[PDB]
Design a protein around this motif. Structure first.
Motif, PDB file in Angstrom:
ATOM      1  N   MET A  50     -11.761   4.530  -6.723  1.00 35.29           N
ATOM      2  CA  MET A  50     -10.980   3.322  -6.325  1.00 35.29           C
ATOM      3  C   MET A  50     -11.794   2.439  -5.361  1.00 35.29           C
ATOM      4  O   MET A  50     -12.161   2.898  -4.236  1.00 35.29           O
ATOM      5  N   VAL A 109       0.814   4.108  -2.731  1.00 35.06           N
ATOM      6  CA  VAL A 109       0.257   5.385  -2.248  1.00 35.06           C
ATOM      7  C   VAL A 109       1.183   6.512  -2.714  1.00 35.06           C
ATOM      8  O   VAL A 109       0.672   7.530  -3.278  1.00 35.06           O
ATOM      9  N   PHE A 111      -7.764  11.566   4.417  1.00 33.77           N
ATOM     10  CA  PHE A 111      -6.759  12.218   3.532  1.00 33.77           C
ATOM     11  C   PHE A 111      -6.202  13.458   4.220  1.00 33.77           C
ATOM     12  O   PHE A 111      -4.968  13.682   4.137  1.00 33.77           O
ATOM     13  N   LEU A 163     -13.625   5.231   2.851  1.00 34.56           N
ATOM     14  CA  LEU A 163     -12.922   6.464   3.317  1.00 34.56           C
ATOM     15  C   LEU A 163     -13.738   7.740   3.133  1.00 34.56           C
ATOM     16  O   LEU A 163     -14.635   7.785   2.217  1.00 34.56           O
ATOM     17  N   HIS A 198       0.880  -1.207   0.000  1.00 29.53           N
ATOM     18  CA  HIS A 198       0.000   0.000   0.000  1.00 29.53           C
ATOM     19  C   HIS A 198       0.899   1.234   0.000  1.00 29.53           C
ATOM     20  O   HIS A 198       0.671   2.209  -0.780  1.00 29.53           O
ATOM     21  N   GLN A 245     -10.986   0.013  -3.431  1.00 31.21           N
ATOM     22  CA  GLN A 245     -10.231  -0.143  -2.151  1.00 31.21           C
ATOM     23  C   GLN A 245     -10.432   1.069  -1.219  1.00 31.21           C
ATOM     24  O   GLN A 245     -10.207   0.910   0.009  1.00 31.21           O
ATOM     25  N   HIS A 246     -10.861   2.235  -1.724  1.00 33.37           N
ATOM     26  CA  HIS A 246     -11.152   3.438  -0.891  1.00 33.37           C
ATOM     27  C   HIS A 246     -12.650   3.661  -0.616  1.00 33.37           C
ATOM     28  O   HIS A 246     -13.053   4.827  -0.413  1.00 33.37           O
TER      29      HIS A 246
HETATM   30  C1  HEM Z   1      -2.897  10.169  -1.858  1.00 31.02           C
HETATM   31  C2  HEM Z   1      -3.378   9.243  -1.021  1.00 31.02           C
HETATM   32  C3  HEM Z   1      -3.599   7.796  -1.324  1.00 31.02           C
HETATM   33  C4  HEM Z   1      -3.274   7.086  -2.416  1.00 31.02           C
HETATM   34  C5  HEM Z   1      -2.556   7.657  -3.611  1.00 31.02           C
HETATM   35  C6  HEM Z   1      -3.727   5.766  -2.203  1.00 31.02           C
HETATM   36  C7  HEM Z   1      -3.501   4.834  -3.177  1.00 31.02           C
HETATM   37  C8  HEM Z   1      -3.872   3.560  -3.024  1.00 31.02           C
HETATM   38  C9  HEM Z   1      -3.541   2.622  -3.979  1.00 31.02           C
HETATM   39  C10 HEM Z   1      -2.769   2.916  -5.255  1.00 31.02           C
HETATM   40  C11 HEM Z   1      -4.066   1.481  -3.524  1.00 31.02           C
HETATM   41  C12 HEM Z   1      -3.885   0.219  -4.283  1.00 31.02           C
HETATM   42  C13 HEM Z   1      -2.588  -0.389  -3.732  1.00 31.02           C
HETATM   43  C14 HEM Z   1      -2.745  -1.887  -3.668  1.00 31.02           C
HETATM   44  O1  HEM Z   1      -3.549  -2.390  -2.825  1.00 31.02           O
HETATM   45  O2  HEM Z   1      -2.074  -2.583  -4.476  1.00 31.02           O
HETATM   46  C15 HEM Z   1      -4.728   1.715  -2.256  1.00 31.02           C
HETATM   47  C16 HEM Z   1      -5.370   0.831  -1.415  1.00 31.02           C
HETATM   48  C17 HEM Z   1      -5.852   1.136  -0.132  1.00 31.02           C
HETATM   49  N1  HEM Z   1      -5.840   2.319   0.477  1.00 31.02           N
HETATM   50 FE1  HEM Z   1      -5.171   3.825  -0.270  1.00 31.02          FE
HETATM   51  N2  HEM Z   1      -4.340   5.586  -1.014  1.00 31.02           N
HETATM   52  C18 HEM Z   1      -4.267   6.819  -0.455  1.00 31.02           C
HETATM   53  C19 HEM Z   1      -4.728   7.241   0.770  1.00 31.02           C
HETATM   54  C20 HEM Z   1      -5.293   6.350   1.630  1.00 31.02           C
HETATM   55  C21 HEM Z   1      -5.679   6.704   2.933  1.00 31.02           C
HETATM   56  C22 HEM Z   1      -5.518   8.105   3.489  1.00 31.02           C
HETATM   57  C23 HEM Z   1      -6.189   5.554   3.529  1.00 31.02           C
HETATM   58  C24 HEM Z   1      -6.712   5.394   4.911  1.00 31.02           C
HETATM   59  C25 HEM Z   1      -6.577   6.345   5.840  1.00 31.02           C
HETATM   60  C26 HEM Z   1      -6.097   4.508   2.540  1.00 31.02           C
HETATM   61  C27 HEM Z   1      -6.508   3.214   2.690  1.00 31.02           C
HETATM   62  C28 HEM Z   1      -6.359   2.224   1.715  1.00 31.02           C
HETATM   63  C29 HEM Z   1      -6.739   0.850   1.953  1.00 31.02           C
HETATM   64  C30 HEM Z   1      -7.373   0.362   3.245  1.00 31.02           C
HETATM   65  C31 HEM Z   1      -6.434   0.170   0.818  1.00 31.02           C
HETATM   66  C32 HEM Z   1      -6.622  -1.296   0.581  1.00 31.02           C
HETATM   67  C33 HEM Z   1      -6.141  -2.143   1.775  1.00 31.02           C
HETATM   68  C34 HEM Z   1      -4.692  -1.916   2.164  1.00 31.02           C
HETATM   69  O3  HEM Z   1      -4.220  -0.760   2.258  1.00 31.02           O
HETATM   70  O4  HEM Z   1      -3.941  -2.894   2.417  1.00 31.02           O
HETATM   71  N3  HEM Z   1      -5.531   5.035   1.405  1.00 31.02           N
HETATM   72  N4  HEM Z   1      -4.570   3.013  -1.986  1.00 31.02           N
END
Ligand code: HEM
Length: 137
Positions: A86, A59, A97, A92, A55, A88-89
């Motif tokens: 997305m 991210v 964020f 949220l 992640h 996965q989000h």
């Molecule tokens: C600019 C901010 C963020 C980006 C670019 C982002 C991007 C991503 C990406 C690309 C994935 C797919 C990655 C993968 O599972 O292979 C993902 C999954 C996920 N994101 Fe985010 N994310 C962001 C912020 C957040 C925030 C702020 C949270 C929670 C506070 C969050 C929670 C999750 C969760 C729970 C998943 C799937 C489960 C895991 O993380 O294992 N994300 N995110």
């Protein structure tokens, strides 16, 4: 400034990504409610869990692209749309964020380095606004 900062973060992105995301999770422990697998883990542990590493790198890879496509710290509406859509989000809200970017700015402010922390603060606010406009709750 902001564009140089993207180049600085990208030059050691896996270290910066892990360290900012840990800063986030340690500042806002209730945020591990979205990441139940992360409970009861020290930082060095988390760094050794594959879904934390892979992640966090994904991210920061995408956040740096969104930062790079921005004009004057204002992200593209398409980038905000993509982030909202997305699957996965689904859990949220903009609060998740906002907290990530508060921890990111505080991290830059505490670092030894000439990051443009005020530009990151505006970037984080502008992204949250864009996410709301694109349909995030
Ligand atoms: C600019 C901010 C963020 C980006 C670019 C982002 C991007 C991503 C990406 C690309 C994935 C797919 C990655 C993968 O599972 O292979 C993902 C999954 C996920 N994101 Fe985010 N994310 C962001 C912020 C957040 C925030 C702020 C949270 C929670 C506070 C969050 C929670 C999750 C969760 C729970 C998943 C799937 C489960 C895991 O993380 O294992 N994300 N995110």
């Amino acid at each position: 400034g902001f564009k140089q900062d993207i180049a600085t973060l990208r030059g050691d992105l896996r270290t910066y990504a892990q360290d900012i995301f840990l800063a986030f999770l340690n500042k806002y422990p209730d945020e591990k409610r979205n990441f139940k697998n992360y409970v009861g883990k020290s930082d060095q542990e988390l760094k050794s869990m594959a879904k934390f590493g892979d992640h966090t790198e994904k991210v920061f890879n995408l956040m740096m692209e969104v930062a790079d496509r921005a004009t004057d710290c204002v992200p593209l509406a398409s980038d905000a749309s993509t982030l909202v859509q997305m699957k996965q989000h689904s859990g949220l809200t903009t609060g998740n964020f906002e907290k990530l970017f508060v921890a990111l700015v505080e991290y830059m402010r505490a670092s030894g380095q000439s990051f443009d922390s005020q530009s990151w603060d505006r970037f984080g606010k502008n992204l949250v606004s864009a996410l709301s406009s694109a349909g995030m709750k």
